Design a protein around this nucleic acid. Structure first.
Lengths: 54, 213
RNA sequence: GCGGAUUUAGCUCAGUUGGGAGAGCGCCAGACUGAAGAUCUGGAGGUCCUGUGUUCGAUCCACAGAAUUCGCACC
RNA sequence: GCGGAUUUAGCUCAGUUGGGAGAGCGCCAGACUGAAGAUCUGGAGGUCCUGUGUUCGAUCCACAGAAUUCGCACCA
RNA sequence: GGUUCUCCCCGAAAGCUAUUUAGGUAGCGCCUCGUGAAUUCAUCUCCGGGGGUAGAGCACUGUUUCGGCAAGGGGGUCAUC
RNA sequence: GUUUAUUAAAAACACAGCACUGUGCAAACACGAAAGUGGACGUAUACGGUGUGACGCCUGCCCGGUGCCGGAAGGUUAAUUGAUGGGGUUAGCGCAAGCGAAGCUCUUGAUCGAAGCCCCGGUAAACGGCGGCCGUAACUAUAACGGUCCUAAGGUAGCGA
RNA sequence: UUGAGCCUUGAUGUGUAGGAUAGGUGGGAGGCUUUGAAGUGUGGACGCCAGUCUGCAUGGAGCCGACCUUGAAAUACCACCCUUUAAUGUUUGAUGUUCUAACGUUGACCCGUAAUCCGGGUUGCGGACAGUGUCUGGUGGGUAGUUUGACUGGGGCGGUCUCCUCCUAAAGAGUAACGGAGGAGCACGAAGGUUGGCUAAUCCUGGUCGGACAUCAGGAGGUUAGUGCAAUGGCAUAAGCCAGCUUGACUGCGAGCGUGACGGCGCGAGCAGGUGCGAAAGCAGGUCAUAGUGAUCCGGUGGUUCUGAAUGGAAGGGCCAUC
């Protein structure tokens, strides 16, 4: 976003729902490392790839 | 994508014109072509796509069958190309000429599980020019397994640069582009490489169309 | 008073992840010289300022203290 | 990160028939010398940048990643 | 810079936040004037405990000194600092 | 000398040579919008920069820095020139979702590219500049004699307030 | 002479088996045959030897192919496929190299003209030069400009509004000074949870691989402990703990309000959907929290049933993302 050792943005969209958001991750440590189950449709927590496909 | 229906419609309307359908002596054929760029030995772009044409053309397919005695009385009725029994496979054990005939001019070799001699007597004749056999169901009521194979083709390459497969005949290019895109879907489903395009054409019993895309 | 360098080999001084202590030079040996330096090849040479804490481990860093020392404050 | 090239010894780098992986300077040891330098010769020398796929066989062919690196995006 | 005739009560205008403030600025009053209203509001006697202004101790942590010894540590001597 | 009448009355200095320097000549300067008039009725020993400090000697040296510029072996990467990729705008092809061509156009930082300047060459008048600790003379201590530190570096061509 | 395209003209290959001089990518199993069309047979002449040439047959017989053999791999019959680059045609450009009706004539002859401007033609010169108009480059204080906080025991310094704790300053609140101590320019691939778990040291004595030490079984039972950079405070039915299971930290409204000056900052009875957490009682909006951003105006940008001066597409706006 501006720096190097930085708290950055990354575009996390849904496993079904099309919807996107972000808040934080960091290039400072290894990266192969996130998805979740969550839901911005709220109906059924199942699959959510993060900005990153883990 | 590889292509879409209208960019295949517009080019089969070309393929079945006299420009590209140069006529020999019979009701003639048309095909869907894909040649690849960076196509090499690794595996991620290698294919086997056994594809029943979603709208079948005028010239059906070369289906051999090997039924067991119970279902035979029905298999007798599904309009198979040629037939051999679960039994008489025991006699084909050495006969090169019959084997090379069947290999060279049939396309699909549908075989019951009890017929496992089938795994031995055909491979080295059929295999090198890429057509395949398959486990026929045990039922009497067999008909849509036969009808499917009597309208299917295959994406043969194991390591080589091109596909080109039968997809239509002389009379209705529009439906035949729903055949054409089905082969392309099998491919983009089996090989997510996409930019490995050299070219996409369509082709008759001779002349090929350098498609609009 | 604040901030800073600094008390690391005879000599000039380098050095730090934060776990080895360095080099031009000087000494000494090995020999070449009757001898010594050069030039040589090998060995060696440390108040790492002190305390404390972090810490695997402090020469280092932070904190507290000595003591030199530098600029500005002073009119 | 866009794309390309590059990464093989301490460093510069050969590495394109896929079959033995190495030269140069310098390091080392002998010869030479009175000692070294220089000349001469032998000897040393690797995360083949990473790691799998393909291969009978991989520095070599494919790809995902990285660092070295050239030009380069940019009206949040 | 300076109230160009008179009169009477409310009426310190003259301050909290500040302000790339320097007698300059946003709302604002403790103001009046026009609507509106309730025990609304203040001191007392009372309810009820948090405060730490005092004060006081030696409790802590920091220690006065004087006794009495707390494998602490000094001076002397044999001794190998 | 009568000079900046107006602070000094020169204790300012206007001289005047010259290495270099501006221009092989519609020459430099251009006041004026159009002059081509100074310089010219004239040539780089005429005329202009920036100065000069009698006269005559004398201008050591020293290029680290910064001037002055001048160049081209080659990198930074602009007008100039435009590989392309992505689109727009749209025929053809689609019961639809939508694909999708010329032409026209949007948009590349394609690839050259040295003003500067890394650079390369020369500058004594271009900018200013002369380093410290450890050991010292048949006496104090003078400070010749000393090993060196990648430190840019210690008073030098004098006469001594 | 040199750039970009295009085959009019070319040409960069020997190893064996295959009666035989085999780039490929591929379909399938047949392909030609009107006699002046096809091979197939056999001489003869050339040589940069890998090229061809010229004669004469026979010829509706069948011959080339999966079909029979061989091998690293077929070859009959069509599709597909031109580039590293030459020769020259056919599109077409551009630096040098120049000649010279541009041009400039502030050079001369001739000429109107007893003429300094000026008229004009021959000549003589150089040369597409000049010219200026934009874009890129710095070059220097040659017009014009500002005198930009305030803090001032009068100024030059050193320190602060910031957003922050402890002093200092007179309790609801505050009131510095070139004053006294010390400060944020940020923090997760978890420092993420809902169950469950408690008892640790130091030193005394034990004992493989010591020579301070590190899991240990017991002293005494001491409420003699710990703090990853900073700090002050937590306070123990432990949050410090740490192994299993595994990452709600919902989309939407809210009586009631705590309140302020436009942002804002705080949360909650109760109602919805069904939301995930649970045996059951039942709980709740994430790193230990204190330190972390935009007056807002302009920007940019990605999505849309929100619109858009007669419309229809639609600029531009709305919604809210994204900064």
């Amino acid at each position: 976003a501006k720096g190097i050792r930085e708290k950055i943005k990354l575009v996390s969209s849904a496993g079904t729902g099309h919807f996107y958001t972000t808040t934080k991750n960091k290039r400072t440590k290894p990266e192969k490392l996130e998805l979740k189950k969550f839901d911005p449709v709220v109906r059924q927590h199942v699959i959510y790839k993060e900005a990153k496909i883990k | 994508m590889l292509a879409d229906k209208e960019s295949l419609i517009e080019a089969l309307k070309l393929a079945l014109s006299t420009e590209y359908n140069v006529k020999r002596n019979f009701t003639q054929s048309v095909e869907i072509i894909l040649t690849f760029k960076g196509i090499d030995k690794k595996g991620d772009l290698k294919l086997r796509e056994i594809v029943p044409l979603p709208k079948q053309p005028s010239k059906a397919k070369r289906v051999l069958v090997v039924p067991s005695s119970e279902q035979l009385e029905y298999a007798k009725k599904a309009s198979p190309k040629v037939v051999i029994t679960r039994e008489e496979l025991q006699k084909l054990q050495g006969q090169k000429r019959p084997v090379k005939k069947l290999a060279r001019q049939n396309e699909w070799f549908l075989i019951n599980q009890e017929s496992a001699l089938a795994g031995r007597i055909l491979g080295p004749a059929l295999g090198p020019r890429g057509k395949f056999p398959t486990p026929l169901p045990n039922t009497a009521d067999i008909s849509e397994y036969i009808n499917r194979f009597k309208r299917s083709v295959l994406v043969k390459t194991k390591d080589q640069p091109q596909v080109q497969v039968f997809i239509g005949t002389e009379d209705k290019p529009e439906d035949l582009a729903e055949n054409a895109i089905a082969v392309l879907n099998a491919i983009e489903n089996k090989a997510k490489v996409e930019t490995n395009l050299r070219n996409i054409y369509v082709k008759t019993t001779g002349k090929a169309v350098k498609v609009k895309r």
